[PDB]
Write a protein that binds this ligand. Structure first.
Ligand SMILES: Nc1ncnc2c1ncn2[C@@H]1O[C@H](COP(=O)(O)OP(=O)(O)OP(O)(O)=S)[C@@H](O)[C@H]1O
Ligand SMILES: Nc1ncnc2c1ncn2[C@@H]1O[C@H](COP(=O)(O)OP(=O)(O)OP(O)(O)=S)[C@@H](O)[C@H]1O
Ligand SMILES: [Mg+2]
Ligand SMILES: [Mg+2]
Lengths: 187, 325, 228, 76, 127, 152
């Protein structure tokens, strides 16, 4: 927790040494070193603390991670591979951004996303008709505007050269992967 | 230049002396590289695998969700192996095999070997021993999710034991592959599905027990249930699908479909109906099917019954389908 | 992408990545390309999984290719040493570093810990192979496999197999991934690829290349021509 | 689960019943606070437990009955 | 963070204090030539190349320019984004849209002025 | 090592660089097979070389620089597991010891143009130890002097 991290930050400066797990647990108000160990591990997994041989190696962030691709046209293979990061604020985008995707195709030209761009997605599964979403249809991803009714869902284009893609929920699997929130272009 | 050829011959000879005859040779002359296959018990899946079955001497992996049909598929494979004269072996690590049902599927239980290992280590050790024995032709392992390291069994519930099974699998494949290729033995692994926490993109499914098996495997098959099969108000079977998600023999990413009928197994003649329809040997007439003009029946079940009762026509259909596809 | 126009002669290379990504096809294409210029090539298949007919489809002269399927790591590396000192072979391939197995491990049980042996064997192999390869002007290519590193809190968790010597001794290192599918209607006929250069002693590193692999044919040359 | 295994190994008990699986709380969740994230911990514990019990049950010839509850899947 | 330029009045540079919308910490190294500052636009005139109303266009400030580049400039001391084509003594700023028409105003009467190139685009508007 | 000795004794070479102490191999290993055990042969050889070269180097005023490599100490409980090859002799005789480490990248858009490098002085006998240094290595140019000057 943030308070636990602060306790190490000032205790180490005040005394010159980090507090023991027993001391942290006692300050937390519970009779178990596990209380301190859980928070120390959580901070370490966050990348804020280092651990070696059961002891802290030190008390020593890269921005949105680019994860994979997405297709404006026909669906494209879904496979996560974190190839790199970009240093940009989550606060810029309307709901906070979670990761970036690379766009191929031209089926959303009118709204303003085109080939080779980066699209910021906000992770969620609650969405409604008329929004811009990301969907997986049998291990293949597409970005389009949603229109759900009955047992069939329509994924509409935003370019007059492309025609809508329709999937029947009784034959193919459909999971919504998030909600688009913006774009970054550097080409 | 002949000065090169003399050196080449000298080097080859010295290698052969140090390591024995047959250590090195031109790839067009080594007959042990040639691939050989045995039947999978369904015609559609044998078509899906380009070479016509599962390759001997290699490794194979099968996975799916629960009640998909893995065990019945592997028993049906064993059965067709034995009718040609081969010896088989089964390792039931989950402690759940049933002799009587395995007999009904067609296996000969008076000659099949079996084992119910206490730990995973002795499972893999028995597999290695059998492979070196040179006298067993097919082996199948019931679940890689039941292969415990010895430390877990002797430990307590809640201990970490992080990453041991992956090391076990890596060592196992690394040691086994050569023995399995020398003895010409086929080994099949069954695997269950789990779910990853924290994955933010893509399919969140995974298989248990490290990730060396997918490297060392030669064929990976995915089996899932897609529907029910009914005679009245009571179900009698299951619809199935199979995906060849990896292949080192022929081109990958094909599909097969068939029925599994309880007590019987894979329904062979339904595949003949479907493939005869595809290859225009069976004349479809709306809800009615006709072969060479005569109406064989209405509906898939009726047509299968007709075929069952008229062996010669089914025979010629099967041979022609084999010839074409 | 490589900068100098291809893989250098008389040096060591490492191609690695995830599974079903294209390592064997790429190496066989290199062998097939080299045989049109009159060189002699060899293949050490430690995984016991080569297929000759498919190697003929891509172009290899199967009748003039030396193939060896060794039992242990030591024998597999000694055959390479013999070929490198022969002075007649121009390309060698080792199917996988993971398949190489110290003899002491073949003898033991499946639970035995042979802690640290494979890396030491490899670090001896490089020390002995470096000089002979240059003296004879022979290209040697290693292929590798990917495993996860436990205990890494933050950052990249992937890692290759076999220790650390091969990184120092490798003149080039290629990373290969599959990124998409190639389709004719509803069928799948190939796979898209991306090859990244991660170490390079003959030009600048960190470049890329994308092409297609079509089953039953090699790499799609004319598509590369179109894109270029 | 430790008690279950201890009685299974003994060879003297023919039937064991576990009243509910939705109540088998992990130790780490007991010593923590409400609101903490414990993503997927009981599932890991259960997998370990089945892996360790599958053999002892058949060797000792015992029947182990798990009772379970129902919850909903959001966003299906 | 980097400064943001909003509405611009005449007689002062783009980065004048009253033109500063705020600071948004965006790393300047992401773009080909280092991005210096950002500038809000009404991009109805550059739709076909993917610029819209309300989006942000990153600029690397420099007076040097060549043909075929997309440049931020001023005519009549008014800010505009458009591509540049030079005839010689005459130069025209051009659109990338289906309804707009060129700008070839006379330098002797009103001269063009460059402030920087356009390196990349960022947006956060409603979808 | 005999070439090094001869150049030191010639009196007309002012810098000698050896490209890897790991790539030095005793003859016994050269004529043997892969898999044998020639424990301690390289370490003994290097110790002999060191105690033979120390005098000549100073007599002729030449500078000899060894490059080395990293390897992992196995089964270590506490401490640092990294190590250098070639035995412990070289650590004693060295007059300065340097560790160079890459810590970042230099980017222009989507193109990597160079590296950012840390450097440390882990042993020194001409002045105080444990000072750092930092700079950039750009392909085709090496160390970027003028960036360092702009910083200093
Ligand atoms: N002895 C049996 N008698 C009748 N039907 C059976 C029998 N055993 C299995 N079945 C059913 O026929 C289908 C066969 O699927 P299975 O062979 O059990 O595959 P499985 O998913 O690998 O088994 P597990 O270990 O429970 S996951 C299923 O519908 C079974 O319910
Ligand atoms: N005999 C074959 N016929 C058709 N396609 C093949 C054949 N062998 C391999 N392929 C396919 O070509 C693609 C690349 O195959 P490989 O080069 O063998 O990949 P690899 O990663 O080097 O080897 P592993 O064992 O998967 S790590 C894959 O999609 C294969 O399915
Ligand atoms: Mg089963
Ligand atoms: Mg391969």
């Amino acid at each position: 927790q943030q308070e636990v991290f602060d306790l190490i930050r000032d205790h180490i400066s005040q005394t010159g040494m980090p507090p023991t797990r027993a001391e942290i647990a006692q300050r937390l108000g519970f009779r178990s070193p596990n209380a301190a160990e859980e928070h120390l591990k959580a901070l370490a997994r966050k990348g804020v603390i280092e651990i070696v041989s059961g002891a802290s190696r030190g008390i020593r962030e890269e921005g949105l991670p680019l994860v994979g691709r997405v297709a404006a046209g026909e669906p494209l293979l879904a496979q996560q591979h974190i190839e790199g990061h970009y240093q940009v604020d989550p606060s810029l985008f309307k709901p906070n951004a979670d990761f970036l995707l690379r766009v191929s195709g031209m089926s959303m030209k009118d709204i303003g996303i085109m080939d080779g761009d980066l699209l910021a997605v906000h992770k969620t599964q609650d969405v409604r008709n008329g929004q811009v979403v990301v969907a997986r249809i049998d291990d293949e991803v597409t970005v389009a505007r949603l229109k759900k009714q009955g047992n069939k869902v329509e994924l509409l284009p935003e370019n007059s050269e492309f025609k809508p893609i329709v999937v029947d929920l009784r034959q193919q699997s459909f999971t919504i992967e998030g909600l688009a929130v913006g774009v970054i272009r550097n080409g | 230049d002949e000065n090169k050829q003399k050196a080449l011959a000298a080097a080859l000879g010295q290698i052969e002396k140090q390591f024995g005859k047959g250590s090195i040779m031109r790839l067009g002359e080594d007959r042990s590289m040639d691939v050989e296959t045995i039947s999978t018990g369904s015609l559609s899946l044998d078509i899906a695998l380009g070479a016509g079955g599962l390759p001997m001497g290699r490794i194979v992996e099968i996975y799916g969700p629960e009640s998909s049909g893995k065990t019945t598929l592997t028993l049906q494979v064993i059965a067709a192996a034995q009718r040609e004269g081969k010896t088989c072996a089964f390792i039931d690590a989950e402690h759940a095999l049933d002799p009587i049902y395995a007999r009904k599927l067609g296996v000969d239980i008076d000659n099949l070997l079996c084992s119910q290992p206490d730990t995973g280590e002795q499972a893999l050790e028995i597999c290695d021993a059998l492979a070196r024995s040179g006298a067993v032709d097919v082996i199948v392992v019931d679940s890689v999710a039941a292969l415990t390291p010895k430390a877990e069994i002797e430990g307590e519930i809640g201990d970490s034991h992080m990453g041991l099974a992956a090391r076990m699998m890596s060592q196992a494949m690394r040691k086994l592959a050569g023995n399995l290729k020398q003895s010409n033995t086929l080994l099949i692994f069954i695997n269950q599905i789990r779910m990853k926490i924290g994955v933010m993109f893509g399919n969140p499914e995974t298989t248990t027990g490290g990730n060396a098996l997918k490297f060392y495997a030669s064929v990976r098959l995915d089996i899932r249930r897609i529907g029910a099969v009914k005679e009245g108000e009571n179900v009698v079977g299951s619809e199935t699908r199979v995906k060849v998600v990896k292949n080192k023999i022929a081109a990958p990413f094909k599909q097969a479909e068939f029925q599994i009928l309880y007590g019987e197994g894979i329904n062979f003649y339904g595949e003949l109906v479907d493939l005869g329809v595809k290859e225009k040997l069976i004349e479809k007439a709306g809800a009615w099917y006709s072969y060479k003009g005569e109406k064989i029946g209405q509906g898939k079940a009726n047509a299968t019954a007709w075929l069952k009762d008229n062996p010669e026509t089914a025979k010629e259909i099967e041979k022609k389908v084999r010839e074409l596809l």
